[PDB]
Every structure is written in structure tokens, then in C-alpha cells.
Amino acid sequence: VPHIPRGPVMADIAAFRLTEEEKQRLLDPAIGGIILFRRNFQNIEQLKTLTAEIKALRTPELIIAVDHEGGRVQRFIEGFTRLPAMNVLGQIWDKDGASAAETAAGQVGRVLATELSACGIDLSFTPVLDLDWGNCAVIGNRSFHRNPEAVARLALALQKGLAKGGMKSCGKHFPGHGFVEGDSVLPEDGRSLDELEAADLAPFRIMSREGMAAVMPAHVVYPQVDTKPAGFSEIWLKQILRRDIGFKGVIFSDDLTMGGIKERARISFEAGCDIVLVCNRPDLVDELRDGFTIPDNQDLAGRWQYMENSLGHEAVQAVMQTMGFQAAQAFVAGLAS
Amino acid sequence: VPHIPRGPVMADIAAFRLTEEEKQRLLDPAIGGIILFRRNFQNIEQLKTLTAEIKALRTPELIIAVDHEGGRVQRFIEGFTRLPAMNVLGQIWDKDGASAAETAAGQVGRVLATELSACGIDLSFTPVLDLDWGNCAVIGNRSFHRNPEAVARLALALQKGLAKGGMKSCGKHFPGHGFVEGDPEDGRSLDELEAADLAPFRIMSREGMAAVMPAHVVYPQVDTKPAGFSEIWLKQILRRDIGFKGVIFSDDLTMGIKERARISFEAGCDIVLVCNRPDLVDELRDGFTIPDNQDLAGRWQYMENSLGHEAVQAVMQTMGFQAAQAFVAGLAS
Ligand SMILES: [Zn+2]
Ligand SMILES: [Zn+2]
Ligand SMILES: [Zn+2]
Ligand SMILES: [Zn+2]
């Protein structure tokens, strides 16, 4: 079982089980982790088998992630508790007050993460910290609330729940996707940095302070700060996110599928990304990995490691048998109806 | 004032008033219409001035469109009635029953179209006929309902309202954007789409829907080309099988351009949209051959607003319209 450091590329796979070609690809030093999609999911039993065999290829084990937010962003459905859209928690905040909503967000996080950890998943790419300005359809119900104070506190409560199911969090989309319109393309947020500090960046600050492991940048240009999109901007990622905010976690790149690949990757690392995502294009991963120079980043190993699931298979299966977890499942299922 | 047929390209503009360069571009025979966005809107007074000067360049007048659906897809805010997201009407259907929800959809259509016609706009790109399978975030609240029967009936009621404000409708996104994840491939069979997602498109086409926008989605069991570039979807299924006689607008071709345009026309689109990239419109239009389409002129004409300058301003003064505005405003709060 080869001992290889986790590389700075997050790739993906085609269907329900690894091909021999995928096995060889995932052994390349360039690769440190995998993102799964709905096309990789048939049922719980099959997913466990898939994650186990990904994990087995090398050490430290490849990090496995998925987009389980809730509502209309939940890759794995059959055998999982159906998760409410995050705005449902924003609505509880409005109706029953902040305390009830925090408690509810805690439960949602616990159920979401715990069911994924049972299947060998390390991390869910959640929460959305984007504010509901009432402008962006693609975000839409995925946002907790309009108010940055509610988004922050519900995001923290969700994160505590996620940690009870073994997972860290990944905030998105830095520095804020909520103000642009998004219903079709690369959109423009025309506001000043001061305006974003007052609202959209506040949850990112708060979450970073409280141990958020990772961040995904917005596919959005903010011309008052930089004409480069956030994912390709030294200003956003190094000046603002690292130095000013103090964030020590992973910065994922923008999806590099959109020079060529290699050039797109180099620009992302230069802008300050730790890891680059390359999805639905194993040909580009092949092109990228051949003769690839792993850029100098002594912080990469620890950043990957921080996202490893803290819970073992058996401890999570055991806690899923308890009355307390079953009650959490029923509660969370009820918020999704 | 040049007499030029409306070409098969729908282009756009940069800001609040036409530049001299945009005037020259919009005079090119390739262009037949304009889509406006939020960046083109400051207030009602300025919009009227903008549409008037677009209209004045040539005859027949360039068709002007906009994405006013409701909720988080509503380009023009200040001075307009704020429109509810379409799922709000789906929720009324569930709570208060189909009849209340149809009545509500009627009012929303009327207010949406009427306020846009007052500003010189011809068409809103609505309704979304995509089903709420709970899969697609980009559609999200923009969909009426999960059930194809409710989507169809609310889309019909909305369409009747739109016609009272002078507008035809444009159903989207054919053959159905609701099942894919959207935050892309729909892996289902044609039989599965006939059973649900295509039903509203059939119903709406049967009841006189004038236009359709195809999905930026590949359905590999029917064709590995996306719906917008598929002879199978647009000619075999939409024209011959369904019997649709209206406009097929392309999806946004901004992703060379000439080749992308040719494929869309060959696949069966009437008109191609090219947005946020006036450089690509320039590239496209230079030495452009307007493809053979004897139905194009009449298809454009059918989308012209049916109400005049005076007629719409007059109906906006009536008690009945004011009541409609208040009702619709209330659904959006
Ligand atoms: Zn669309
Ligand atoms: Zn985006
Ligand atoms: Zn995203
Ligand atoms: Zn789409």
C-alpha cells in the first residue's frame, strides 16, 4: 500500500465502482482527494464499497467529499434522511426565534454528517454563507437568511452538529455570492469592499475564527476590489482571506473545467489556492498530472488532514442505533416535508 | 428610418442608453431583437427613453424582451410591483386549492406584463414550465410545482394574464430542466419525460404559447447533443410530434460563435441569443448569412406587444388594475 502525500488536485470518478484506469489515476502524486456526485451513488451498501476501495489505494487515505447542503443540493437520497433547505432554518429563526433555530441547525448538521460518515465520506461542502439579498436564484433557498448575524449563528450551530457527526465545514462562496443575479455565465458584483465587510464577509470571518476547515470561492468578479474572479485573485485570497481575516484552512479553487489545463492550475496556485478541483473531465486530470510539478506548500498536508473524518465506521453505526439519533433523524425529516 | 427585416439574432446592450457603436450594431440585418438586464435599468423614465430609441432605429421595430419571472428573477425593481416567486403560486395551489391559485396566477401575469408594456417592452421570458423534482437549485423557486398538472394549469392562467397586459409567453426550458442537478446530464428515457416534464410543454403549445426556450441540458438517452443543438428535440419532437408552430429561441450561445450559431439554426432554432458579449455579436454579424427561414418574420411579429402607448397607461389608471397590483404586491411580501 503506497505511502504518498496527498497532492493538490481533487478529482472525481465515473460511476459506482473504480475502473482499473481510475485506480491508476488516483495513485498519481498530484491527486489528494475525490468529490462524489449523484452518478456515483446507487445505495448505502455500494457507496461503502466505493469509499473503502478509494481509501485502500494509498496512505494517507484520499479525502472524499460530497455536496450535501440540503433541499435541492443533496447528492445521495435513497437510505438517507432528506434534509431541509437551509432557508427553512432561517424561517424558524424568524418565527420561533434564534435559539430554537440554532437548536434545529445543530440537529440538521448532526444528521447530515453522521449518515455520510457511516459511508466513509470525510466532508460535506456545507455551509452556504451567502446572504439572501433576494437577487440570486442559483443560491436561492440554499442561503440561511438575509441577515449576516443569522447566517453566521446558524452556520456556527450547523458546524457544531457537523462535528458531532465527525466532519469539519466548508464555507461558500467566499467572499459572497448572494448579491449577484444568478439564473443562467460569469456575473458581476459592483459593490465596494466596505459594503462586503459590513455584511457578506462577516459570516466568513466568524466561521474562520471558529475553526472552519475550508472555503470555496465565488465564480464572481468584484470589479471594485479586482477584475479577476475571487478564485484567481491574490487580493481576495492572500491579502484579504489569509492576512486580514487570518484563515488557516483549505482554499479550494474554482472548477477548472470551465492557456489550457496546467495553465489554469498554475494561476489558481499562484492566486493562493491550496487545492484545485477538476470535475467531469478525467482527460484533463491526465493531461494535468503528466509531468506535474507539485507547488511548494508545506501547509498542504495539515490542511488535508484537518478535513479527515474524526469518527470510525463502528462508532458511527453504533450511535445511529441510539434513540437520541433516531429522534434527530425524525425531527430533521419533518423539517424537509 | 431603414426598412430592414428582423434578423435571427437577439443581442443586448451595455448600460442605460445606447452608445453610437450600439446604434450601428443594432442596425445590422443579423439582429431582430434585444434582451434587457438589470444593468440596463435605473428607473421607469430612463427605461422608456431607452426602449423608444431602440424602437426608432429601424422598421419593423426591434423586439425587446426581459426576464421577469418573479421572486429572485426580476430585472427591474424600482417603480415596479414586486412579483412573487412562482413556487408561491404552487403553495397556494396546495393550501387554498387549484382555483384560488389559478386566479392568483392570472393576476400576477397581468401585473407583470402590463407594467412592462408601459415601458415599451414586448415580451417577458416566462413561464418556467420546469418541474420541481427537488433536484435543481438554479431553477429552485422559479418552478411552480412538482406536479405537471399544476405547472400546466398555473402556466396557462399566467399566460392569460400576460395576454391581458399585451404579451405572449415563452415557456422554458424545453424539454425540462427540473430533474438535473444545477448548482449537466438528465439520464432518463423519453418515455419518462413524456410522463411528466414534457406534459406542460404539450399543453401550453396546444393552448397557443408563442415561444419556447430550450434547456442547456443533455439527455443522453434521446441525443448526446444538448436540447438547443438537437434536431431530435427541436424538429422531431417539438415541431412534428408536439406540433409547436411558435418561436424557438436558442439558449445563450456565450461559451467559434459562427459555428455555435450555425448548429443552433441547423438544429431548428429560429433566433439565437448572444448575451454579455457584444464582441461575439460583432464577430457573428460580419459576413453573416441569414439562414433560410420563411417563417421567421411572422414568428417575430407574433411576439410584438398587442397594446399601445395610450391603451396600457389608461388601463393602469383603472381601479381593477390597481387592485391587481395590491394583490400581487401582497403575495410577494
Ligand atoms: Zn434559462
Ligand atoms: Zn456561480
Ligand atoms: Zn457552488
Ligand atoms: Zn442550466
Side-chain angles (χ1 to χ4, degrees):
Chain A
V1 171
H3 204 122
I4 317 179
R6 290 163 177 147
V9 180
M10 177 164 265
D12 65 0
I13 68 133
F16 308 115
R17 290 296 305 293
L18 295 178
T19 70
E20 211 55 28
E21 184 180 309
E22 290 172 330
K23 288 172 157 154
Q24 292 298 117
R25 175 155 42 244
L26 307 213
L27 287 161
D28 190 305
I31 294 157
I34 291 292
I35 171 163
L36 296 178
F37 301 98
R38 183 165 291 181
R39 66 165 195 270
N40 309 122
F41 185 74
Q42 210 178 28
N43 56 68
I44 301 292
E45 191 204 31
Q46 160 276 328
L47 182 59
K48 286 159 164 170
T49 305
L50 174 60
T51 61
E53 71 173 341
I54 288 161
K55 296 250 171 256
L57 293 166
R58 52 193 277 177
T59 317
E61 297 180 342
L62 292 163
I63 293 302
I64 303 174
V66 69
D67 301 304
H68 270 212
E69 288 168 34
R72 307 196 184 85
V73 184
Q74 180 180 344
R75 306 314 182 203
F76 312 156
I77 299 303
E78 183 182 294
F80 283 81
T81 301
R82 195 76 176 82
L83 300 166
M86 292 303 91
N87 82 323
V88 174
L89 298 181
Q91 289 169 359
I92 294 163
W93 176 286
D94 291 345
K95 180 88 142 43
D96 301 335
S99 216
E102 285 168 308
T103 292
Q107 301 285 32
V108 173
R110 190 190 176 188
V111 173
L112 180 165
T114 298
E115 298 180 352
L116 290 172
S117 305
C119 305
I121 304 295
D122 289 296
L123 172 75
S124 192
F125 290 128
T126 191
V128 171
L129 302 173
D130 298 319
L131 306 185
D132 188 29
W133 290 107
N135 286 346
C136 199
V138 71
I139 300 302
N141 283 12
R142 299 161 68 190
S143 168
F144 289 103
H145 207 260
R146 181 200 194 75
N147 190 330
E149 199 64 28
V151 170
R153 285 175 63 191
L154 294 171
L156 286 172
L158 190 96
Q159 172 169 279
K160 292 169 187 198
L162 291 173
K164 296 199 179 180
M167 298 191 163
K168 303 301 180 288
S169 66
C170 177
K172 55 196 191 183
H173 306 76
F174 177 89
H177 202 301
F179 190 86
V180 298
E181 262 162 315
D183 36 71
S184 87
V185 72
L186 203 181
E188 191 187 299
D189 190 322
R191 301 176 294 161
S192 68
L193 178 55
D194 274 31
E195 292 185 77
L196 273 89
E197 292 289 355
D200 305 63
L201 280 155
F204 291 93
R205 276 178 188 285
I206 293 159
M207 287 291 280
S208 180
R209 153 155 62 70
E210 301 293 327
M212 173 169 70
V215 139
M216 205 122 332
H219 183 59
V220 176
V221 183
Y222 305 78
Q224 297 205 35
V225 186
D226 195 334
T227 57
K228 291 158 161 167
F232 303 109
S233 172
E234 278 200 52
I235 295 168
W236 280 119
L237 306 187
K238 289 179 167 155
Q239 189 182 317
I240 294 160
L241 187 61
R242 291 293 187 208
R243 244 176 293 138
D244 194 351
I245 293 170
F247 175 68
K248 317 202 82 175
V250 174
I251 294 168
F252 292 105
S253 76
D254 216 327
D255 223 294
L256 301 193
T257 299
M258 278 306 287
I261 209 67
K262 289 182 176 295
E263 187 62 18
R264 274 196 305 257
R266 187 190 63 71
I267 291 162
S268 299
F269 294 129
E270 187 178 75
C273 301
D274 292 296
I275 292 153
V276 294
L277 267 58
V278 186
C279 310
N280 313 307
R281 290 299 296 278
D283 63 302
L284 296 190
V285 173
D286 283 348
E287 198 189 343
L288 181 59
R289 73 196 183 78
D290 191 76
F292 178 70
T293 307
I294 293 162
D296 180 46
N297 191 345
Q298 283 295 134
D299 293 321
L300 180 59
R303 282 164 184 166
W304 272 129
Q305 179 183 33
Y306 191 68
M307 311 197 288
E308 291 175 38
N309 204 286
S310 36
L311 300 178
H313 171 69
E314 294 153 16
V316 69
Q317 283 291 328
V319 84
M320 284 184 66
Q321 264 21 78
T322 66
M323 178 53 200
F325 189 76
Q326 287 175 49
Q329 290 177 306
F331 179 73
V332 170
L335 299 182
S337 80
Chain B
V1 170
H3 272 242
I4 318 176
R6 289 164 178 147
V9 180
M10 178 164 270
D12 65 1
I13 68 134
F16 309 111
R17 199 74 79 78
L18 295 178
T19 70
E20 292 306 293
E21 182 184 318
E22 291 172 331
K23 287 172 186 172
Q24 292 299 116
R25 174 155 43 242
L26 307 212
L27 287 161
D28 190 306
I31 294 157
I34 291 291
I35 172 164
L36 298 176
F37 300 86
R38 181 164 292 188
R39 66 165 194 272
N40 309 122
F41 185 74
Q42 227 150 38
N43 56 68
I44 302 291
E45 189 194 24
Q46 159 277 327
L47 181 59
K48 286 160 163 168
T49 303
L50 173 62
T51 61
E53 71 174 342
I54 287 161
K55 255 84 186 90
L57 292 166
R58 53 193 278 176
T59 312
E61 298 178 343
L62 291 167
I63 293 301
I64 305 175
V66 68
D67 301 308
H68 268 213
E69 289 168 33
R72 304 190 185 83
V73 184
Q74 180 181 344
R75 304 317 181 203
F76 312 155
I77 299 303
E78 184 175 297
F80 282 82
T81 301
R82 195 78 176 82
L83 301 166
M86 293 303 91
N87 82 321
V88 174
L89 298 184
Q91 289 169 356
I92 294 164
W93 176 286
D94 290 345
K95 183 179 149 209
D96 303 332
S99 212
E102 286 169 307
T103 291
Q107 299 282 50
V108 171
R110 193 188 172 188
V111 170
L112 178 168
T114 300
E115 298 179 352
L116 291 172
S117 307
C119 304
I121 305 296
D122 291 292
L123 173 73
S124 191
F125 289 125
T126 195
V128 171
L129 304 174
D130 298 319
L131 307 184
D132 192 24
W133 288 106
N135 285 348
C136 199
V138 72
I139 298 304
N141 284 10
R142 300 162 68 190
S143 167
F144 290 105
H145 206 260
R146 182 202 195 76
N147 189 331
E149 203 206 344
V151 171
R153 285 175 64 191
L154 295 171
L156 286 171
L158 191 98
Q159 171 169 282
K160 290 170 192 172
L162 292 172
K164 294 208 164 196
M167 297 192 164
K168 303 295 180 291
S169 63
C170 181
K172 56 192 194 184
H173 307 75
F174 177 89
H177 202 303
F179 190 87
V180 297
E181 278 166 297
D183 40 74
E185 267 188 18
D186 190 324
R188 300 177 294 162
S189 67
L190 179 55
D191 290 352
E192 293 184 79
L193 273 89
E194 292 290 353
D197 305 61
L198 279 156
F201 291 94
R202 276 179 189 284
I203 292 159
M204 287 289 280
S205 184
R206 153 155 62 67
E207 303 293 327
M209 170 167 72
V212 145
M213 195 128 17
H216 186 191
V217 174
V218 185
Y219 306 78
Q221 304 216 60
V222 187
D223 195 334
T224 56
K225 290 158 150 171
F229 307 118
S230 172
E231 277 199 55
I232 295 169
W233 280 119
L234 308 185
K235 288 179 170 156
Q236 187 169 306
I237 294 160
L238 187 62
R239 293 293 186 202
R240 245 176 293 138
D241 192 352
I242 293 170
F244 176 68
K245 313 196 79 165
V247 177
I248 297 165
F249 296 88
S250 79
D251 221 316
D252 232 298
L253 300 190
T254 296
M255 221 68 223
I257 187 67
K258 279 173 182 295
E259 188 60 19
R260 227 144 46 246
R262 189 193 59 72
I263 292 162
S264 299
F265 294 130
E266 187 183 73
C269 300
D270 294 296
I271 294 152
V272 293
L273 268 61
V274 185
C275 308
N276 313 310
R277 290 298 295 280
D279 62 302
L280 297 188
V281 173
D282 281 350
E283 199 194 342
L284 183 57
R285 73 196 183 78
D286 191 79
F288 178 70
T289 307
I290 293 159
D292 180 46
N293 188 345
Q294 289 184 301
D295 295 317
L296 180 60
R299 283 174 182 156
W300 270 130
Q301 179 180 34
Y302 203 65
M303 312 309 276
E304 290 173 26
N305 201 288
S306 54
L307 300 177
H309 216 58
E310 287 95 355
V312 70
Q313 283 292 330
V315 84
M316 284 185 69
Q317 264 23 77
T318 67
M319 177 210 316
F321 189 74
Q322 286 169 31
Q325 291 176 306
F327 181 74
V328 173
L331 304 174
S333 80

